[PDB]
Design an enzyme around this catalytic site. Sequence first.
Site, mmCIF file in Angstrom:
data_model
loop_
_atom_site.group_PDB
_atom_site.id
_atom_site.type_symbol
_atom_site.label_atom_id
_atom_site.label_comp_id
_atom_site.label_asym_id
_atom_site.label_seq_id
_atom_site.Cartn_x
_atom_site.Cartn_y
_atom_site.Cartn_z
ATOM 1 N N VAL A 1 0.851 -1.211 0.000
ATOM 2 C CA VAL A 1 0.000 0.000 0.000
ATOM 3 C C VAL A 1 0.873 1.243 0.000
ATOM 4 C CG1 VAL A 1 -1.713 1.342 1.366
ATOM 5 C CG2 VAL A 1 -1.978 -1.109 1.108
ATOM 6 N N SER B 1 13.350 -1.067 10.758
ATOM 7 C CA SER B 1 14.605 -1.801 10.672
ATOM 8 C C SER B 1 15.738 -1.216 11.524
ATOM 9 C CB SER B 1 15.041 -1.904 9.206
ATOM 10 O OG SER B 1 16.302 -2.532 9.061
ATOM 11 N N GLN C 1 1.929 1.425 7.698
ATOM 12 C CA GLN C 1 2.570 0.321 8.410
ATOM 13 C C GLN C 1 1.633 -0.791 8.881
ATOM 14 O OE1 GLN C 1 6.002 -0.068 8.427
ATOM 15 N NE2 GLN C 1 5.861 -1.935 9.621
ATOM 16 N N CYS D 1 -11.916 -0.629 1.586
ATOM 17 C CA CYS D 1 -11.853 -0.778 0.157
ATOM 18 C C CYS D 1 -13.146 -0.943 -0.641
ATOM 19 C CB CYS D 1 -10.752 -1.728 -0.300
ATOM 20 N N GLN E 1 -14.077 -9.972 -4.605
ATOM 21 C CA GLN E 1 -12.824 -9.444 -4.089
ATOM 22 C C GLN E 1 -11.513 -10.100 -4.526
ATOM 23 O OE1 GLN E 1 -15.250 -8.164 -0.156
ATOM 24 N NE2 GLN E 1 -13.050 -7.945 0.179
ATOM 25 N N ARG F 1 -14.193 -13.738 -1.922
ATOM 26 C CA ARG F 1 -12.862 -13.631 -2.507
ATOM 27 C C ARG F 1 -12.780 -14.472 -3.781
ATOM 28 N NH1 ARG F 1 -9.549 -11.248 1.330
ATOM 29 N NH2 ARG F 1 -9.676 -9.577 -0.248
ATOM 30 N N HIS G 1 -11.508 -5.062 -7.053
ATOM 31 C CA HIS G 1 -12.681 -5.538 -6.351
ATOM 32 C C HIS G 1 -13.833 -5.185 -7.264
ATOM 33 C CE1 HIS G 1 -10.514 -6.470 -2.884
ATOM 34 N NE2 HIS G 1 -11.011 -5.614 -2.009
ATOM 35 N N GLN H 1 -8.366 -1.868 -6.058
ATOM 36 C CA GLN H 1 -8.287 -1.909 -4.590
ATOM 37 C C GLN H 1 -7.166 -1.088 -3.986
ATOM 38 O OE1 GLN H 1 -6.905 -2.851 -0.789
ATOM 39 N NE2 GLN H 1 -5.913 -4.095 -2.361
#
Lengths: 357, 357
Positions: A13, A38, A60, A122, A149, A256, A263, A339
Amino acid sequence: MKNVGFIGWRGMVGSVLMDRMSQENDFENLNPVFFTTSQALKSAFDIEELKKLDIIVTCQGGDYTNEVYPKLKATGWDGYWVDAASALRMKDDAIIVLDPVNQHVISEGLKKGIKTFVGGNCTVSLMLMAIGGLFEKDLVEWISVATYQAASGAGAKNMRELLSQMGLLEQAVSSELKDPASSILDIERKVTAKMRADNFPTDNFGAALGGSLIPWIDKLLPETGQTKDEWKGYAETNKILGLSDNPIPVDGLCVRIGALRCHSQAFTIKLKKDLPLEEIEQIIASHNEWVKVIPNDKEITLRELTPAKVTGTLSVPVGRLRKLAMGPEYLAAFTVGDQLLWGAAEPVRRILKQLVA
Amino acid sequence: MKNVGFIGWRGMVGSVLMDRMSQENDFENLNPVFFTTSQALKSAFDIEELKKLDIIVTCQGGDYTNEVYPKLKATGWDGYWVDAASALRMKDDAIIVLDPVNQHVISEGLKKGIKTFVGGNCTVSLMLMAIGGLFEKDLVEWISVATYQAASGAGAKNMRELLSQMGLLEQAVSSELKDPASSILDIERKVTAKMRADNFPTDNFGAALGGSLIPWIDKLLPETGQTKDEWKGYAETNKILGLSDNPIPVDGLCVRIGALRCHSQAFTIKLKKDLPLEEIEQIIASHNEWVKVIPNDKEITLRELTPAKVTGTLSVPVGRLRKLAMGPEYLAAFTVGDQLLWGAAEPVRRILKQLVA
């Protein structure tokens, strides 16, 4: 210029956000500070380095937000938190963004003193980007949904699993597909046998996706019977539209299928009043510049209203528009949308643009 | 013993019929006469040889039926015509069969002197086998459908095209998938690029199916806006149930997905009266021995309610049963069924069994 911090910019993303921002030259409008989790760039856990920023943009995830956000708000930080994760959507001091749909709600929030802006679900945001005009003109009583999806909503390893599964299915009958005379039932028996085998990779999905479907997305919610993803239909459509006082019902099944990034959704929309078809088409088309009304013709639906066409683009086609057999107040609509864009990174990029302006 | 002629027994549906009949030892109860269209065994066009038989069973197709049926009927032929093709479904001297659902309608037709028995539409047959109890107890007001259709409903070459499409999609990123550190965005870009290429086989579908979907099945009917497949929902559900005088509305969108031989369907069922969930489950479960009520839990839905599970079996699982947000009179149901069996060859095999007994 506003000093903006970016976390999770290397994930899926986050990478889409970086690419879209680069494409639109959004970096020449702010001062970017990149963070990392990291230990091998600033630390995403260094609360003091995060306190210096005006805006924090994170892709994140929930496990990060739920750890860092409360710690940073405890230091007295009056800055803006822009989040792609779901973690904060249902908090009172947080607004769910999708500006072409809810610009008024966001403007009222900036005035009210809201400091947390979270991207929406979404399927819900892709639905609103398509069927948005009907919500503005208050023509929606309720919407029944059935989704198609893509693997991207579940993650990167999930997309890879789907592709690996697709390949192993053909590989199982590679020689038989070559000669036009071979038995189709034999080919089928062999593909289904491979799909059912022990070595067939189903670790990320828990079931086969390629050549099949999975009618369950996310954890069960025992109270309504819905899954977490299905619940976001009622919860989020009304939070995005500011209609938490007068809740319009949106419910259905989340399935799905074997698509990578788009989607798709089939709708049964109950309109409050009886209106002509030619008018409903103009009301949908006029809402935003991304929505595209596809006429109910074969060649054009095949060419325009599919994941093949829409993948990696901001276009949100809506089609198969007609009145249903239950009444002239029942509309049928089918939509397709990417999406990772309107369903993930694009509403995030757009609220940021407003904040740094 | 009844002398029965079989036409189109080497095609896909016809082959499934031969296999099922062999599995159930149905040939021991009749005298089989096999026909061919080949000039390279009796001729399927020899009206005189066909006239000698008590029953004709055909899976050859509409173009055969429309040519041979009126000619054979013009000779005064007293026998039975059992057809897997759609050609005769809407005729007044024809009954649409699905015995676990419409046994009374069939018996009344045999006692009335109906000589033409036609197998029904796949999606409609698979729906009735799933939620038949709700139609028995007259609990259905209307049904909105969103289908997830397999390539088999379109034919053999179509199933082969889907498999070939799946193969080229993985092959395009074969070495990138083997590397656990490679970019997911780069992978999707390449798969989408191959899906979009000129050499990607889309001849039978007219669009990509593997890694995508096509929200259009069969020709447009300008009258209602429906496609010929979507129209069969209203037309056929009522003809099967004998409710052509008081028509229950069944409408929705028919979408083709990347599955081999199982059609899956998402429903929004409006019940006439408000009944408990624990009772609705028992009503659906008790209608026939093939339907299976899948409890609304994750691990079991993943294992049971999928094309991977039901392919090549007579089992018709129904799940995701819950009340929708529009009211306690609105039920959600998701079903999966094998298209070649209950949606093609099985109702045909079953009416024949009744006829030869």
